[PDB]
Design a protein around this ligand. Structure first.
Ligand SMILES: [Ca+2]
Ligand SMILES: [Ca+2]
Ligand SMILES: [Mg+2]
Ligand SMILES: [Mg+2]
Lengths: 548, 548
């Protein structure tokens, strides 16, 4: 198999992970000094949030130079040694390629806003890197994504006298991919980093590249074509490098970002459709919507692999659920108004689950056992909280909590001098929630997480096996099998907060002896009609091999 | 039913619970400010370690004045206000009457050590308050209790020129209960507190009062006759007040401390027999010893109620298990030789269980579901640790951890000026483990404990029902019923660290459906031969009711 299929991913922001020089901002030297923590946690590939020069109006997704390091984070040389030290430790690392827009401070946009022509009269080559309109009436049938900030996707640029298109913030003008030179510029941006040894890219906001009148301006055939070009380029020029897409769309649309066997697109896509049903199914003590949504995902190409996650640096997105589910999710997980932002909930894993260790463990085990390669959000392995007093999505991006010392060990500077303030509340503060205390706690969440990944690593069927749901006869209980090589895993999960009883339909398994992945504790052999009675306590998970 | 049968007890030491005035010693005004906390926790009866004047060589169990309060803890006025406030909240409170011995600083012993006649000529009537010997050869077939410190139960007083008897420290001379003046000195000491409104006494070291040649000096009929005289006096003079015996013995001797219907002794005896077997059954993943030791206990009288506990101010005693059981307990629970003391193990509950919250919950459910009245040791409801740097058994007696501020909120005095230092390690220190953050944490051990005690209070069968074990077919799984009034409870606990299957013998309940105590979710109806298949995950507990 290709490496990304057995990998575990870990998502972190250089700026909030480890400060290495005392200024209160994370940097690449600080990240390099913590590589062994990631190695020993059991992660294979680091996904770094954007590291580029940037006025940071959207925390680095507003790029002002695709081929440099933001000053906060150190230098291109610090980047280079970090890669050397990550590779030397058997760590793949991928960056975040922001294709759809730049910062308004980018050189290109600064030129482009001068207008169609320079003062001397000659044409302005950069004007058509962006999307311009005289009165901003095109593409009127389009969602606004950042509903709490942006009232329109067109903004009047004072100096050009014309409106420009932006799907995200006004300070993030969209790039015009009907211009072949723009396409070549981003081919070039990609080459610069993949030449430095970078192992591939998370590609940001891929459904929004091209816009056509008469359409949603989403998942257009033509934006797929550009993405095919990207893949073709790294297939010819950088074989083995990974392309990973963030496409938060309904299932029938997401799978298309894999392309076909004859025209490949992305190697991997984030499984956005499962992520909200997982939470919904917890509060509802009914798992049918997990199965229903998994059932709508068509098959994927031979190279394709799902990327499973629970949380990330963004809000918990409710863009791709129904009206009723969104309302349900809000009342269940956003009791307080400030927890909402842009059709979504800006909260961390542990607080969403009320810090209930048995729920955190339950969801993680489902994460680790569904088809695909999982990605952990930094700090969830120790149970970090959120700071909802911070604006936008910053509340889920506070510093890594490494110990109980100053600023949680993230920095020698004081907490009020750090880029985001380390969390210090009684429940989630670095006095209570920190890496060093979990390395000494025999039963910490950190040790549970590392051990559960190790369990996963010893059973290839979690990464490569097919998936078949099992009936169970109780909505609160989810059951499926993973089959790969000659091993059949059976995994059973109780989403109710009390004991539940089920009747698993193991008719194909009559004669097989279920045993326990941890210690091979025997269960009764499947007999008769193969309808198998199980009782489970609250939020239990049964990880079982079905011996033949 | 008498109040002590449905009460929840809470054991605390006034010196280490809450300092009210900043001097580093807990006191009665500070304890008074925490009564609301105990009330909300779900406790009914406070049991206070000895609060009397004393030089504290044995942390107060060496009493120098049976009718005062130790100046560290406040005044008698402060005590009276505390008692008044405790009763205003519906709490009962029992004290600790040390009957076997006194401090060698007690004025009785100071008079006595002068010898049998005074220098003014006249005889010294205090000389016969204690047990003297000319050479110390008597009662030689008697064990030493504090084997680590004492080499003999006799000691030479230089002033007296004779040896004197002591089951515990040389600083705790045994009182002579063949002297009738000693019996009445302790009746009056009991009377003094009962007159103040104290609801009862825990009686220290009841097995060791009377010594006799040619015996173990243990459980002697004469010491039983004295206890019938303590009970007779409380029955005639103070109806409804509680007598509670600390008697660590094998089951057939422990039940004698209840007395009989005709000749009552104690209302309650600590169930020292099961306590070691709960811990043995966890590491063995085999519960048969719980059932056997439970079966060796005869019916107790109508007024009697067992007192169930997990840990206490002392070591986990191994004095009444077999040699094989004791070697297993040491290997399992005292990896470090320094955790052993006096045929026991000096560690707190959470450390014993490797800070494993699933194991802590399991033992606490079993503790709340066996027959009796549970007593909780202060601090185990938040998961405190121990300090092996403290001598003797002081490591389990460190100050209560209320919040993350100065000395964990116990005191405004710095940690090093508190009577015992508050724990500050990374796993168990008050920055991590404290009451305030567990009140703010919706899924804390403190909230779980209070919720569990609320579920137990909702089902009187726990406090008053009979007990019947049932087969299960797997030693790892323990199951029993409690039946009282119309209600039958069914409790199933898995002591193994991975998932386990069983087959429950439920023949007497065919046609009845087990339903969940928490959230009325019903399990399948009991059918056929009533052999009922269950699966259970690691350390699961099933609190169930059996319908009609
Ligand atoms: Ca676009
Ligand atoms: Ca004695
Ligand atoms: Mg820095
Ligand atoms: Mg004080």
């Amino acid at each position: 198999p290709e490496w990304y299929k057995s990998a575990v991913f870990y998502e972190l922001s250089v700026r909030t992970f480890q400060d290495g020089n005392g200024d209160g901002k994370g940097d690449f030297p600080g990240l390099t000094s913590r590589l062994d923590y990631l190695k020993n946690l059991g992660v294979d590939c680091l996904w770094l949030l954007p590291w580029f020069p940037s006025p940071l109006r959207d925390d680095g997704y507003d790029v002002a130079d695709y081929r440099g390091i933001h000053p906060d984070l150190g230098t291109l040389d610090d980047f280079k040694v970090f890669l050397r030290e990550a590779h030397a430790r058997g760590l793949w690392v991928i960056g975040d390629l922001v294709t759809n827009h730049t910062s308004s401070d980018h050189p290109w946009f600064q030129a482009a806003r001068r207008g169609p022509t320079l003062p001397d009269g000659s044409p302005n080559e950069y004007h058509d890197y962006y999307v311009w309109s005289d009165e901003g009436k095109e593409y009127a049938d389009t969602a606004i994504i950042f509903t709490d900030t942006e009232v329109s996707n067109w903004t009047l640029d004072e100096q050009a006298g014309k409106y420009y298109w932006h799907r995200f913030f006004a300070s993030q003008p969209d790039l015009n991919y009907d211009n072949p030179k723009v396409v070549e510029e981003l081919h070039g941006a990609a080459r610069f980093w993949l030449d430095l040894g970078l192992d591939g890219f998370r590609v940001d906001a891929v459904p929004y590249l091209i816009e056509r009148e008469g359409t949603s301006c989403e998942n257009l055939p033509e934006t797929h074509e550009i993405l095919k070009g990207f893949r073709a380029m790294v297939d010819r020029e950088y074989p083995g490098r990974l392309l990973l897409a963030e496409a938060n769309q309904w299932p029938e649309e997401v799978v298309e970002y894999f392309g076909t066997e004859a025209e490949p697109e992305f190697h991997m896509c984030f499984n956005f459709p499962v992520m909200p049903r997982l939470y919904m199914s917890l509060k509802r003590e009914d798992t049918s919507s997990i199965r229903e949504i998994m059932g709508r995902l068509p098959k994927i190409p031979s190279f394709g692999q799902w990327c499973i996650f629970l949380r990330n640096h963004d809000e918990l997105t409710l863009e791709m659920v129904t009206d009723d589910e969104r309302a349900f999710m809000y009342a269940a997980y956003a009791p307080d108004a400030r927890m909402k932002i842009n059709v979504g909930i800006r909260r961390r894993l542990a607080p969403l689950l009320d810090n209930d260790r048995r729920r955190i463990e339950l969801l993680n085990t489902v994460l680790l056992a569904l088809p695909g390669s999982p990605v952990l959000y930094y700090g969830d392995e120790i149970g970090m909280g959120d700071d909802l007093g911070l604006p936008d999505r910053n509340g889920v991006r506070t510093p890594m909590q490494w110990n109980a010392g100053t600023s949680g060990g993230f920095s020698t500077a004081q907490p009020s001098d750090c880029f985001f303030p380390p969390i210090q509340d009684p429940v989630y503060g670095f006095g209570r929630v920190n890496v060093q205390s979990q390395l000494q706690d025999p039963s910490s969440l950190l040790k549970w997480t590392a051990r559960q990944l190790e369990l996963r690593r010893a059973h290839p069927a979690f990464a490569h096996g097919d998936l078949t749901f099992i009936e169970t006869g109780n909505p609160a209980i989810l059951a499926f099998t993973r089959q790969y090589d000659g091993e059949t895993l059976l995994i059973v999960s109780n989403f109710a907060g009390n004991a539940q009883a089920g009747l698993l339909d193991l008719a194909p398994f009559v004669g097989r002896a279920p045993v326990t992945l941890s210690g091979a504790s025997p269960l009764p052999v499947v007999t008769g009609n193969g309808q198998y009675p199980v009782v489970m306590g609250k939020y239990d998970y049964y990880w079982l091999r079905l011996n033949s």
